[PDB]
Design a protein around this ligand. Structure first.
Ligand code: CDL
Ligand code: PC1
Ligand code: PC1
Ligand code: PC1
Ligand code: PC1
Ligand code: 3PE
Ligand code: 3PE
Ligand code: 3PE
Ligand code: 3PE
Ligand code: 3PE
Ligand code: CHD
Ligand code: SF4
Ligand code: SF4
Ligand code: SF4
Lengths: 318, 158, 388, 48, 46, 56, 176
């Protein structure tokens, strides 16, 4: 019954990533005064299937890889970690109920930079690596503020249990008391996943080749599935963290509906933002963190440690 | 149920063909003027993406090369380089007089008289430039050309 | 010379300007040397023009700056007319200003939107090519071709405006300022866009003139120079408009100048629609301009002139002229030499993009690699005219 | 065309045909001129 | 035949056409925006 | 043009403009595709007398 | 007459400084940019449903070439070679002779459609409206050889498209 419950989490994730690609192309289209996919299946509902079948029958590129082992680890590591990040999410009950769910998710996402680093080193092209190194410095940079911001929030929740975040926001969303942190959190999840205006990997491809340049259609398609899995998961986490739905233990499915709608609307705000702004230059997205977000994140971390004490509002430990 | 091998191969062939024509990611050499009409084929009025044809594709994920402008002798080696890097199945669409056969610089010393001297071409789109609608007709002709492929059916009878 | 990165836009992206091979030396993120290699769209156009009559050579000028089709035609026509010593009639001069400003709008939409598209701002590109698509219809209704009209010819224009065109142009112009405003709601005050353009590719006024720059590249640095105002050529002395002038000489001022030129073009188009006069469209002189198809099938003299005009062509008196116009990209000029026959002896094309691109190395000094994309975009380079 | 029918000419096609490219009815170019230089035909007579 | 029939503007000219930049100024002043933001924090903290 | 009033209010508010006054699309404010035949004028040299080419 | 595109001096009162501080920290202009994109999502797309819907053209449109006939059925072309002489791309090749009835008619009329620039000079130069550019723009082919038109092809195009071509000439011949 648990093996089933795992496949009731893995398979639906892959299908959501499949149909996020349709939703992305159609939302971008209508913001650009066009229709987007609407020919392959009714309203483009078969576009993801055609793209999927097309890529896996495509002739593979020539690996020409320096390290065969690290060539195959990178996609396996990326895909496996992306699926693993979903096991502690309370929707409203987690698949695995962890007492340190927040650290488990924070710790697991820190390993996601190995896929970037390995594939770049295994690519066998010198400009591919400098692409991977530039991306890694961006990923680990915006992890810093995510950890500190997450630390600040958990000082009003009182635990690392992800299901305790629901109880904290039973009376009111944490978006009110922590909107300065929700702003910098939301951006850092854009930069964490390498999304516009932070998708320097795709934008500067000609200047510096991206790390995923060497993989064939099938293997490259897997790198891409892991990347939207993270984007959906980081907005599900954004919803639980700052827009906590109320849980009625007799009607759990009502939580799952209201919860799901909030996850989509943030996930479609990623698409909304992609269609609205130009890209950052690399030294500018490093300036934004080390010289804007980090000073404010540290000041608000100091504030959110002092505030519970001076208002007598320290949350329970249990 | 009961089914022959011939029937199975015909249906699988229809599946892969439907996928390949439904998801045509084009690489575009915007060599000259004809690239401007290629850009109008992506703009709102025609919107090639609604057919499943992505606006921008990398050379090594592309399915079709669209040669939109004059191919000069200085540029010909680079175009053949890109063509070789493209993974199969690969198709070339020749757009406009210049690429089709040299056009209005056909008698020039610096111009390749047609891109079929460099790479194999599947569809020729006439015009100087072809209208965005004329290019769209050409791409839809490539989809029908792909629909009629019989790779599996031939393989069975080998 | 930490490393030399030979950047070929051979695998071209959705820009369509052409293809540029750029050879750079990157001492880290910074750029120390930039070396454009520009033979890839060289088609021998100037030599081919020597084997064509003056009329046969005109379509070559559509295909130079292939986003300024009717402005390139006007430069050729103004040069040939000057050697012929003839004058186009007043109605055609207004049609040539009217479509000269519709062409300026066409060019700046491509210039600003593809500049922004390269710097990641994809959406305004789609917003504005719905407008360019409506402008392409004006081109097709007067000439039959969406792009290469071949409409502006020495002596005037090929045909008269079809009935109902001026109303449709007015309807387009009435809604168009709002379209520009939407574009500025996404770029003018956007901090990301400003960070990518402000104080990038600065050019001093003194270095601009010596390097041969023209157009926005001068006016961004504060030089008060516009050929339409100082050396007017059609009816531009009869239309009121202001020249936008920059103050810092960076990309952001050049971006602002172009966006303000689009507004002044709509201002001019408004005056052309109201002041359009009646009359004929081509010089009433059949040894230069072909007669009407009705007269050619009725009159012996018209048939003879029709027969000779479309075979030998009109002969141009011997002489050499340098004619330049304020093209959207800059000063577009032709040095045209006539040996007295019906085919030009030499036709040298002065492309504003030729000098601007040569000035890239100067502008790129002390900038990151990602800035070079912004510098090339603000120059508005199309390789049809860079190479010819 | 219902309100404003096209003028009738006997040479105009009655059955419109669509693009025949890639089919056994496609158009194949060929020269429409007759031979220029005629060759002298040797006599069948053998006498030496 | 009939007097010349050409493409001409309607008698009286066309109506005025806007060309000037118009970005309408929206939103509350600087002071008000901070007060609304800070007011929300206090309500959330309370 | 066929947007309900609520959606009209929304997109007007988001952009800060009265979009319905200056719609991007064209409906029936465009010229008719069929127009009356023209009668174009003749040039200044269409004279039956005092029109010697040597003086122009 | 010139104007300054960017010569403002920012005000240095506290009220204005706070306005820019609020803008810098609260991302005001960035939200405004998000508003414009949101408005377009609820605007109607400009896309048309090709091939069921087509983009508007005019009578003057320059498309595929065809050779025309008189109402009686005789070919309009008299082999004057004015089109061949004018053709900027040298796309036209003509040969002629006296027909069996002594008429001045071509025996070869060819257009290399891959040389042609679709400029329409040949129809401007024809004295008898024999060569025209039709309204067809959908005739892309799979092989290069299918784009080298001989006389039969262009005569067949005239027979195929005469109904439309004649109406387009009727609509524009007065402008010409
Ligand atoms: C998401 C949460 C909001 C759901 C709102 C659903 C909705 O009806 O919005 C459209 C509806 C129409 O918006 P509109 O832009 O003003 O109408 C444009 C045309 O006038 C529209 O007028 P029209 O005459 O062109 O409409 C004809 C239309 C007939 O259909 C409609 O007009 C609306 C169909 C949406 C039904 C939901 O024909 C169709 O296309 C129907 C075929 C099926 C299309 C797919 C519609 C279902 C999508 C949902 C599937 C999953 C559930 O929204 C509103 O009327 C505004 C009220 C507030 C809505 C919230
Ligand atoms: C995996 C998800 C697949 C879900 C969609 C069904 C896919 C199978 C469709 C099929 O086999 O028939 C296609 C058929 C093939 O047609 P056909 O080959 O049977 O042709 C017969 C046509 N008539 C009867 C008119 C002569 O085409 C369709 O009708 C499309 C059906 C798919 C619609 C699914 C959309 C909702 C999802
Ligand atoms: C990869 C993840 C490995 C397991 C991570 C366990 C975790 O962090 O969650 C603690 C979790 C969560 O801890 P918790 O404190 O939140 O809750 C534990 C349960 N209670 C509270 C009731 C006591 O702890 C466990 O569930 C124990 C799992 C058993 C230990 C498994 C040991 C073997 C794991 C494989 C080792 C790694 C293999 C090689 C890896 C290669 C290099 C990356
Ligand atoms: C067989 C399963 C093996 C595993 C495959 C991979 C995983 C499972 C994915 C299954 C694919 C499901 C989508 C099928 C798409 C059907 C095509 C369609 O959408 O119809 C619209 C299309 C529409 O035709 P169109 O593409 O020409 O449309 C032109 C555009 N319009 C119409 C707007 C002008 O219908 C077809 O033409 C049919 C295409 C062939 C479909 C062949 C696949 C059917 C399934 C056969 C399986 C055979 C197994 C042996 C028995
Ligand atoms: C990981 C899952 C991802 C999602 C699903 C991925 C898509 C899966 C659905 C698509 C499967 C299609 C399989 C065919 C692959 C493409 C074949 C092709 O393109 O043709 C090239 C080749 C054609 O062969 P070929 O030899 O002519 O091609 C080479 C030609 N020369 C020699 C000139 C170079 O097709 C194949 O090789 C087919 C392989 C076997 C396919 C299975 C057939 C089994 C059924 C018949 C037996 C029935 C007996 C009873
Ligand atoms: C405004 C949203 C609204 O209508 O109220 C939210 C409503 C109540 O929230 P509830 O989950 O019951 O718990 C609140 C305190 N725990 O709960 C719901 O209405 C269910 C969720 C539907 C509303 C989703 C709002 C998401 C807003 C964030 C996405 C922003 C999208 C771009 C704007
Ligand atoms: C009341 C506070 C008044 C403001 C305090 C002074 C603000 C800084 C003054 C200053 O000198 O600013 C200019 C300069 C900015 O440097 P910069 O612009 O990056 O130079 C490169 C150009 N792009 O500044 C600098 O170069 C140095 C600024 C360093 C600040 C780093 C502080 C990081 C920690 C954030 C604060 C956290 C709380 C610290 C503990 C406080 C305890 C009371
Ligand atoms: C169903 C309901 C519609 C669904 C659409 C979403 C809900 C929003 C609808 C708007 C609600 C009505 C507000 C308008 C009322 C108003 O008139 O005040 C607006 C005014 C500024 O605008 P203006 O009208 O020009 O000011 C003059 C007004 N006397 O006063 C103001 O300053 C307010 C202007 C709006 C600024 C606040 C809202 C900004 C959006 C939140 C910020 C984050 C957005 C991006 C987040 C990323 C996505 C998750
Ligand atoms: C009583 C004590 C209580 C304690 C608090 C009291 C004081 C509270 C008032 C202070 C509020 C702090 C504001 C926190 C937000 C972060 C501010 C910030 O970092 O903005 C500055 C940053 C760069 O600044 P820059 O424009 O480059 O200026 C030049 C550099 N000096 O600009 C940027 O961030 C650029 C970001 C670019 C990417 C933006 C793309 C998305 C924009 C739309 C998202 C809308 C918000 C989404 C919200 C999601 C919520 C779930
Ligand atoms: C999405 C819907 C967007 C609504 C349309 C855009 C809009 O109304 O925002 C304009 C408003 C005014 O901004 P502005 O023009 O720069 O002038 C302000 C003077 N300081 O700008 C604003 O006032 C928006 C401020 C939003 C508050 C900051 C975002 C906080 C995010 C966490 C919630
Ligand atoms: C990999 C995935 C198939 C996996 C699956 O559904 O099981 C397929 C389905 C749709 C595809 C996407 C879209 O079809 C097209 C997108 C547009 C750009 O070309 C980038 C790739 C792009 C983002 C594609 C990435 C990937 O190949 C996708 C996501
Ligand atoms: S075919 Fe015509 S439009 Fe295309 S590149 Fe050549 S000259 Fe330009
Ligand atoms: S349209 Fe122009 S290039 Fe084509 S055949 Fe006629 S004259 Fe020659
Ligand atoms: S088509 Fe016209 S111009 Fe050409 S040879 Fe025939 S009659 Fe003369």
């Amino acid at each position: 019954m648990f093996m089933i419950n795992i496949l009731m989490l893995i398979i639906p994730i892959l299908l959501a990533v499949a149909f996020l690609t349709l939703v992305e192309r159609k939302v971008l289209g209508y913001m650009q005064l066009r229709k987007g996919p609407n020919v392959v299946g009714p309203y483009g509902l078969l576009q993801p299937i055609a793209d999927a079948i097309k890529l896996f029958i495509k002739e593979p590129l020539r690996p020409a890889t320096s390290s065969a082992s690290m060539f195959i680890l990178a996609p396996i590591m990326a895909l496996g970690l992306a699926l693993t990040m979903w096991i502690p999410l309370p929707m409203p009950y987690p698949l695995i109920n962890m007492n340190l769910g927040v650290l488990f998710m924070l710790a697991m996402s820190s390993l996601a930079v190995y896929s970037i680093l390995w594939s770049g080193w295994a690519s066998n092209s010198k400009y591919a690596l400098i692409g991977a190194l530039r991306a890694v410095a961006q990923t680990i940079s915006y992890e810093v503020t995510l950890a500190i911001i997450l630390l600040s929030v958990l000082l009003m929740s009182g635990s690392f249990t992800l299901s305790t975040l629901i109880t904290t926001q039973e009376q009111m969303w944490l978006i009110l008391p922590a909107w300065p942190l929700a702003m910098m959190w939301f951006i850092s999840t854009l930069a964490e996943t390498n999304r516009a205006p932070f998708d320097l990997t795709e934008g500067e491809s000609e200047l510096v080749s991206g790390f995923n340049v060497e993989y064939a259609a099938g293997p490259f398609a897997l790198f891409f599935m892991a990347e939207y899995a993270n984007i959906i998961m980081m907005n599900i986490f954004t919803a639980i963290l700052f827009l906590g739905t109320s849980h009625n233990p007799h009607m759990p499915e009502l939580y799952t509906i209201n919860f799901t709608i909030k996850s989509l609307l943030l996930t479609m705000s990623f698409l909304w933002i992609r269609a609205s702004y130009p890209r950052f230059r690399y030294d500018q997205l490093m300036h934004l963190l080390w010289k804007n977000f980090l000073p404010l994140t540290l000041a608000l971390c100091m504030w959110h440690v002092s505030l519970p004490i001076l208002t007598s509002g320290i949350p329970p430990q249990t | 149920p009961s089914s022959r091998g011939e029937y199975v191969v015909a249906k699988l062939d229809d599946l892969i063909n439907w996928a390949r024509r439904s998801s045509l990611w084009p690489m575009t050499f915007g060599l000259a003027c004809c690239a401007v009409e290629m850009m109008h084929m992506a703009a709102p009025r025609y919107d090639m993406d609604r057919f499943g044809v992505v606006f921008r594709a990398s050379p090594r994920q592309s399915d079709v090369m669209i040669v939109a402008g004059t191919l000069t002798n200085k540029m010909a080696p680079a175009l053949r380089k890109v063509y070789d890097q493209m993974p199969e199945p690969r198709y070339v669409v020749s757009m406009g007089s210049c690429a089709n056969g040299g056009g209005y610089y056909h008698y020039s010393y610096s111009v390749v008289r047609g891109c079929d001297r460099i790479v194999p071409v599947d569809i020729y789109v006439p015009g100087c430039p072809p209208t965005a609608e004329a290019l769209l007709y050409g791409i839809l002709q490539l989809q029908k050309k792909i629909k009629r492929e019989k790779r599996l059916r031939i393989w069975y009878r080998r | 010379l930490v490393s030399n990165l030979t950047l070929n836009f051979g695998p071209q992206h959705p820009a369509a300007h052409g293809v540029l091979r750029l050879v750079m030396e990157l001492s880290g993120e910074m750029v120390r040397k930039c070396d454009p290699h520009i033979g890839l769209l060289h088609r021998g156009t100037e030599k081919l023009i020597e084997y064509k009559t003056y009329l046969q050579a005109l379509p070559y000028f559509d295909r130079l700056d292939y986003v300024s089709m009717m402005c390139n035609e006007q430069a050729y026509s103004l040069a040939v007319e000057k050697l012929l010593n003839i004058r186009p009639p007043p109605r055609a001069q207004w049609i040539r200003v009217l479509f000269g400003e519709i062409t300026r709008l066409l060019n700046h939409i491509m210039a600003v939107t593809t500049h922004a598209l390269d710097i990641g701002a994809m959406t305004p590109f789609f917003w504005m090519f719905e407008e360019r698509e409506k402008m392409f219809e004006f081109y097709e209704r007067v000439s039959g071709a969406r792009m290469h009209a071949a409409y502006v010819r020495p002596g005037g224009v090929h045909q008269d405006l079809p009935l109902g065109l001026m109303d449709d142009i007015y309807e387009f112009s009435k809604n168009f300022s709002l379209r520009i405003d939407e574009l500025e709601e996404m770029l003018t005050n956007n901090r990301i866009w400003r960070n990518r353009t402000v104080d990038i590719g600065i050019v001093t006024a003194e270095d601009a003139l010596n390097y041969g720059f023209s157009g926005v590249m001068l006016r961004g640095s504060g030089i008060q120079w516009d050929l339409r105002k100082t050396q007017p050529y059609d009816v531009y002395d009869q239309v009121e408009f202001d020249v936008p002038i920059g103050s810092r000489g960076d990309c952001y001022d050049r971006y602002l100048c172009r966006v303000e030129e689009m507004r002044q073009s709509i201002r001019i188009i408004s005056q052309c629609l109201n002041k359009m006069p009646p009359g004929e469209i081509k010089v009433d002189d059949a040894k230069v301009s072909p007669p009407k198809r009705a007269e050619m099938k009725t009159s012996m003299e018209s048939l003879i002139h029709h027969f000779k005009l479309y075979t030998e062509g009109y002969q141009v008196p011997p002489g050499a002229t340098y004619t330049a116009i304020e093209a959207p990209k800059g000063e577009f000029g032709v040095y045209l030499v006539s040996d007295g026959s019906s085919r030009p002896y030499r036709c040298k094309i002065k492309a504003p993009g030729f000098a601007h691109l040569a000035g890239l190395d100067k502008m790129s000094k002390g900038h990151m690699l990602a800035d070079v994309v912004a510098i090339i975009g603000t120059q508005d380079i199309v390789f049809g005219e860079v190479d010819r | 065309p219902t309100v404003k029918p096209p003028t009738a000419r006997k040479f105009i096609w009655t059955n419109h045909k669509f693009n025949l490219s890639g089919t056994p009815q496609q158009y194949v170019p060929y020269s429409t001129t007759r031979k220029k230089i005629q060759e002298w035909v040797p006599p069948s007579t053998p006498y030496k | 035949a009939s007097k010349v029939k050409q493409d001409m503007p309607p008698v009286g000219g066309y109506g005025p056409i806007d060309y000037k930049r118009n970005l309408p100024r929206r939103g509350l002043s600087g002071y008000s925006m901070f007060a609304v933001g800070i007011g929300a924090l206090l309500f959330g903290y309370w | 043009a066929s947007a309900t009033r609520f959606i009209q209010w929304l997109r007007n508010w988001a952009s800060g403009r009265d979009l319905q006054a200056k719609l991007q699309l064209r409906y029936q404010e465009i010229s008719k595709r069929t127009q009356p035949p023209p009668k174009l004028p003749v040039g200044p040299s269409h004279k039956l007398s005092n029109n010697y080419y040597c003086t122009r | 007459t010139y104007k300054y595109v960017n010569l403002r001096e920012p005000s240095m009162d506290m009220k204005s400084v706070t306005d820019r501080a609020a803008q810098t920290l609260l991302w005001t202009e960035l939200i405004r940019g998000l508003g414009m994109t949101l408005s377009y999502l609820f605007r109607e797309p400009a896309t048309i449903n090709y091939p069921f819907e087509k983009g508007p053209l005019s009578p003057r449109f320059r498309g595929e070439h065809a050779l025309r006939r008189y109402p009686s059925g005789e070919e309009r072309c008299i082999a004057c070679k004015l089109c061949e002489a004018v053709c900027p791309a040298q796309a036209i090749t003509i040969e002629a002779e006296p027909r069996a009835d002594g008429s001045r008619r071509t025996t070869r009329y060819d257009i290399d459609m891959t040389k042609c620039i679709y400029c329409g000079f040949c129809q401007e130069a024809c004295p008898v409206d024999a060569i025209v550019e039709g309204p067809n723009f959908e005739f892309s082919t799979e092989t290069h050889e299918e784009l080298l038109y001989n006389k039969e092809k262009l005569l067949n195009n005239g027979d195929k498209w005469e109904a439309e071509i004649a109406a387009n000439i009727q609509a524009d011949y007065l402008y010409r």
